[PDB]
Design a binder for this molecule. Structure first.
Ligand SMILES: [Ca+2]
Length: 357
């Protein structure tokens, strides 16, 4: 009941991120379609957490540049949240922020520029922007999906937030919807939970659902992408939409996203609390950066591997639902993979151990 908050280091500790690794030798790309960041907020934040500030650079795509608006409740909140969460957990990595116009082409161009960048050479790309998969122009969905396929071929990992408006994803057409780019089978879709944890243990972790007014994790069954071969044993249910139908299940993994148990951050000079699935992609991008540093080679496309790893690698979320539109409880969490939290929250050290050759 009483609202709380954590620093990124607290959440990483709860999820047991591997120690002694900081992402040295890695580069994390962050995609931004609006706003910007200021050096004052970043320097203050990293210093406050006692970590050596990672190098952060801006890259202009299609004329867009780093332009913070100054409003802590605006897009700066998204941009700075992404950099602060990823940078605080992988401070040894270099952060490259790609700014592009808020258009379908800008979104695509930012992704491809980051993926093929010979100067910054990112090994990981984190995305916290999106929209209902069925509201996108089919041609755009195709181009972006191929960009993600190319990234997988090049050994670059791509992570994306699953959404903050439950199973209906903000649409009021009497149907359930999943978000894109999260729906792409080549993206690691990140869902959200309500985490109650301390340094040594997780007391409780449930589906993030604060009703219509507070938001809920995105999740469901795609109506565009078929069920991937590597996800056929996860027991993804048929769509809840009349007519049913098999499809790629969203999300793949999940992490703390409930604003009521959110992240303490500094946005445009203001210390505040922010949540949402937007925080989960950069959180796990940092985890991947640590793993890559240890392995000496980038893990790149992880989805196929994740679904065949032993279940002990994840913390299974079984309680709650992401329905904020009606009383039907579509969709509900349960044992194993579900359309609210996927495989659950990852156990960092167990994931690294399982990925060691
Ligand atoms: Ca589950």
């Amino acid at each position: 009941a009483a609202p709380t908050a954590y620093t990124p280091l607290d959440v990483a500790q709860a999820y047991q991120f591997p120690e002694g690794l900081d992402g040295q030798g890695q580069c994390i790309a962050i995609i931004a379609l609006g706003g910007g960041y200021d050096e004052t907020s970043l320097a203050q934040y990293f210093a406050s957490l006692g970590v050596s500030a990672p190098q952060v650079v801006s890259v202009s795509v299609d004329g867009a540049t780093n332009q913070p608006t100054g409003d802590p409740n605006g897009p700066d909140g998204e941009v700075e949240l992404d950099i602060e969460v990823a940078g605080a957990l992988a401070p040894g990595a270099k952060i490259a922020v790609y700014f592009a116009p808020n258009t379908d082409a800008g979104f695509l161009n930012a992704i491809t520029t980051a993926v093929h960048d010979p100067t910054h050479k990112p090994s990981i790309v984190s995305i916290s922007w999106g929209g209902p998969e069925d509201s996108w122009a089919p041609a755009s969905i195709a181009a972006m999906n191929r960009a993600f396929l190319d990234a997988a071929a090049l050994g670059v990992t791509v992570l994306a937030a699953a959404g903050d408006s439950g199973s209906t994803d903000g649409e009021q057409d009497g149907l359930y919807h999943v978000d894109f780019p999260a729906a792409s089978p080549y993206v690691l879709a990140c869902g959200g939970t309500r985490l109650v944890a301390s340094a040594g243990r997780i007391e409780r972790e449930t589906v993030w659902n604060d009703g219509p007014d507070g938001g809920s994790t995105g999740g469901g069954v795609s109506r565009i992408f078929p069920l991937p071969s590597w996800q056929e044993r996860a027991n993804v249910p048929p769509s809840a939409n009349p007519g049913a139908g098999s499809g790629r299940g969203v999300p793949d993994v999940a992490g703390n996203a409930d604003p009521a148990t959110g992240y303490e951050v500094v946005i445009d000079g203001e210390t505040t609390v922010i949540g949402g699935t937007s925080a989960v992609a950069p959180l796990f991008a940092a985890l991947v950066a640590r793993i890559n540093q240890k392995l000496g080679k980038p893990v790149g496309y992880l989805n196929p591997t994740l679904y065949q790893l032993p279940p002990e690698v994840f913390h299974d979320i079984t309680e709650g639902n992401n329905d904020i539109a009606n009383r039907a409880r579509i969709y509900q969490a349960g044992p194993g993979w579900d359309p609210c939290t996927g495989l659950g929250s990852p156990i960092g050290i167990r994931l690294l151990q399982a990925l060691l050759p």
